[PDB]
Design a protein around this motif. Structure first.
Motif, PDB file in Angstrom:
ATOM      1  N   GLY A 111      21.550  37.639  12.286  1.00 36.21           N
ATOM      2  CA  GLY A 111      22.204  36.305  12.987  1.00 36.21           C
ATOM      3  C   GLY A 111      22.070  36.545  14.148  1.00 36.21           C
ATOM      4  O   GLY A 111      21.898  36.858  14.602  1.00 36.21           O
ATOM      5  N   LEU A 146      23.819  42.769  23.291  1.00 40.47           N
ATOM      6  CA  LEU A 146      24.462  41.103  22.923  1.00 40.47           C
ATOM      7  C   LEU A 146      23.466  40.943  21.338  1.00 40.47           C
ATOM      8  O   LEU A 146      24.462  40.311  20.357  1.00 40.47           O
ATOM      9  CB  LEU A 146      23.923  40.651  23.411  1.00 40.47           C
ATOM     10  CG  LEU A 146      25.324  40.667  24.638  1.00 40.47           C
ATOM     11  CD1 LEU A 146      24.495  39.310  26.336  1.00 40.47           C
ATOM     12  CD2 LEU A 146      26.246  40.057  24.858  1.00 40.47           C
ATOM     13  N   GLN A 147      21.946  41.279  20.873  1.00 39.10           N
ATOM     14  CA  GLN A 147      21.526  40.907  19.992  1.00 39.10           C
ATOM     15  C   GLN A 147      22.382  41.567  18.268  1.00 39.10           C
ATOM     16  O   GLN A 147      21.931  41.254  17.683  1.00 39.10           O
ATOM     17  CB  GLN A 147      20.016  42.204  20.180  1.00 39.10           C
ATOM     18  CG  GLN A 147      19.434  41.069  18.917  1.00 39.10           C
ATOM     19  CD  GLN A 147      18.092  42.283  19.061  1.00 39.10           C
ATOM     20  OE1 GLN A 147      16.632  41.473  18.834  1.00 39.10           O
ATOM     21  NE2 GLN A 147      17.923  43.557  19.361  1.00 39.10           N
ATOM     22  N   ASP A 195      16.815  39.261  12.199  1.00 38.41           N
ATOM     23  CA  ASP A 195      18.099  39.743  12.944  1.00 38.41           C
ATOM     24  C   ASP A 195      19.277  39.859  11.735  1.00 38.41           C
ATOM     25  O   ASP A 195      19.805  41.045  12.274  1.00 38.41           O
ATOM     26  CB  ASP A 195      17.919  39.095  14.211  1.00 38.41           C
ATOM     27  CG  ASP A 195      18.966  39.919  15.629  1.00 38.41           C
ATOM     28  OD1 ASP A 195      19.832  40.036  15.606  1.00 38.41           O
ATOM     29  OD2 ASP A 195      18.506  41.392  15.705  1.00 38.41           O
ATOM     30  N   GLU A 246      19.270  34.187  23.490  1.00 38.54           N
ATOM     31  CA  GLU A 246      18.518  35.831  22.581  1.00 38.54           C
ATOM     32  C   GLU A 246      17.309  35.622  21.859  1.00 38.54           C
ATOM     33  O   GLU A 246      16.372  36.304  21.538  1.00 38.54           O
ATOM     34  CB  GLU A 246      19.882  35.880  21.914  1.00 38.54           C
ATOM     35  CG  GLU A 246      19.291  36.496  20.408  1.00 38.54           C
ATOM     36  CD  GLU A 246      20.294  36.735  19.831  1.00 38.54           C
ATOM     37  OE1 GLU A 246      22.187  36.381  19.907  1.00 38.54           O
ATOM     38  OE2 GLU A 246      20.707  37.636  18.673  1.00 38.54           O
ATOM     39  N   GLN A 258      25.268  41.507  17.612  1.00 34.48           N
ATOM     40  CA  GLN A 258      26.547  41.068  17.572  1.00 34.48           C
ATOM     41  C   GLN A 258      26.297  39.633  17.094  1.00 34.48           C
ATOM     42  O   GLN A 258      25.594  38.579  18.283  1.00 34.48           O
ATOM     43  CB  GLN A 258      27.290  40.759  19.349  1.00 34.48           C
ATOM     44  CG  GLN A 258      28.271  40.348  19.451  1.00 34.48           C
ATOM     45  CD  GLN A 258      28.574  39.942  20.803  1.00 34.48           C
ATOM     46  OE1 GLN A 258      28.467  39.925  21.612  1.00 34.48           O
ATOM     47  NE2 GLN A 258      30.235  40.057  20.915  1.00 34.48           N
ATOM     48  N   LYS A 259      26.300  40.223  15.624  1.00 31.41           N
ATOM     49  CA  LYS A 259      25.737  38.466  15.393  1.00 31.41           C
ATOM     50  C   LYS A 259      27.404  37.494  14.968  1.00 31.41           C
ATOM     51  O   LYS A 259      28.015  38.050  14.042  1.00 31.41           O
ATOM     52  CB  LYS A 259      25.147  38.692  13.858  1.00 31.41           C
ATOM     53  CG  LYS A 259      24.424  39.782  14.480  1.00 31.41           C
ATOM     54  CD  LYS A 259      23.598  40.576  13.382  1.00 31.41           C
ATOM     55  CE  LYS A 259      23.261  42.241  13.670  1.00 31.41           C
ATOM     56  NZ  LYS A 259      22.859  42.600  12.185  1.00 31.41           N
ATOM     57  N   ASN A 269      24.448  35.376  17.838  1.00 31.40           N
ATOM     58  CA  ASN A 269      25.127  35.439  19.013  1.00 31.40           C
ATOM     59  C   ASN A 269      25.373  34.002  19.488  1.00 31.40           C
ATOM     60  O   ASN A 269      24.985  33.089  19.430  1.00 31.40           O
ATOM     61  CB  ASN A 269      24.920  36.469  20.165  1.00 31.40           C
ATOM     62  CG  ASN A 269      26.218  36.855  20.418  1.00 31.40           C
ATOM     63  OD1 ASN A 269      27.302  36.272  20.602  1.00 31.40           O
ATOM     64  ND2 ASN A 269      26.286  38.206  20.960  1.00 31.40           N
TER      65      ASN A 269
HETATM   66  N   LIG Z   1      23.086  38.587  17.773  1.00 33.79           N
END
Ligand SMILES: [N+]
Length: 218
Positions: free
Chosen positions: A82, A102-103, A80, A52, A105-106, A84
């Motif tokens: 957070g 996916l970026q 960001d 990421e 989703q933290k 993943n």
């Molecule tokens: N993330």
């Protein structure tokens, strides 16, 4: 300060990873320390995504597999909100398209990061006593590349070009060392790690003390 520190004994270090040919060690190192602080603070150890950072964290002179800076890794996480997991956004050793779903989703967050005073092994030792710390060293010589065991003393210069993580320190036989987590697989060094000469002054062995930083999670 204690005479021995080893974050592996505290369950704060994920197993050794392998970066391959991509020059994304800056990402390996920032992730390893975020993994460490997250364990310390939350009590749970989770393997996080270097991919990421490579794909979504390009900024200024930090350009994926082309090279970059540890601190831009921390800054990506901060900006960001957070990061993943390794399982959700796995490493491919390639520069890829940032996957935005996916970026977004933290699972893990950090609040800020600090730099350790450069060229000051005592200040670095103090920092390592509380958490793993990210550093860069000069890994260009064959002695470094060839390392298999023992406390490494050089030869190596101080014009840093390879980011790694310090996970502890200790002394053996009267010789002080730092314990370094590298990202060259378990087939390099002592199962993926290196013990390197400590308390030599100035930038430290291979410039290990010249540019340290660590993430902060209140
Ligand atoms: N993330």
């Amino acid at each position: 300060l204690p005479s021995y520190v080893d974050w592996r004994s505290a369950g704060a270090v994920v197993d050794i990873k392998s970066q391959g040919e991509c020059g994304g060690c800056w990402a390996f190192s920032a992730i390893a320390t975020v993994e460490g602080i997250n364990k310390i603070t939350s009590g749970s150890l989770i393997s996080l995504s270097e991919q990421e950072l490579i794909d979504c964290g390009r900024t200024q002179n930090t350009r994926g597999c082309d090279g970059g800076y540890i601190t831009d890794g921390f800054q990506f996480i901060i900006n960001d909100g957070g990061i993943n997991t390794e399982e959700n956004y796995p490493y491919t050793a390639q520069d890829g398209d940032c996957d935005v779903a996916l970026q977004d989703q933290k699972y893990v967050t950090i609040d800020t990061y600090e730099n350790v005073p450069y060229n000051n092994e005592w200040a670095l030792q103090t920092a390592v006593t509380y958490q793993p710390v990210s550093v860069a060293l000069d890994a260009a010589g064959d002695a470094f590349k060839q390392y298999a065991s023992g406390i490494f003393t050089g030869p190596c210069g101080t014009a840093v070009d390879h980011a790694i993580v310090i996970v502890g320190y200790g002394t053996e036989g009267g010789v002080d060392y730092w314990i370094v987590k590298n990202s060259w697989d378990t087939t390099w060094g002592e199962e993926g790690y290196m013990r390197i000469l400590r308390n030599v002054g100035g930038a430290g062995t291979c410039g290990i003390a010249t540019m340290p930083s660590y993430p902060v999670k209140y």
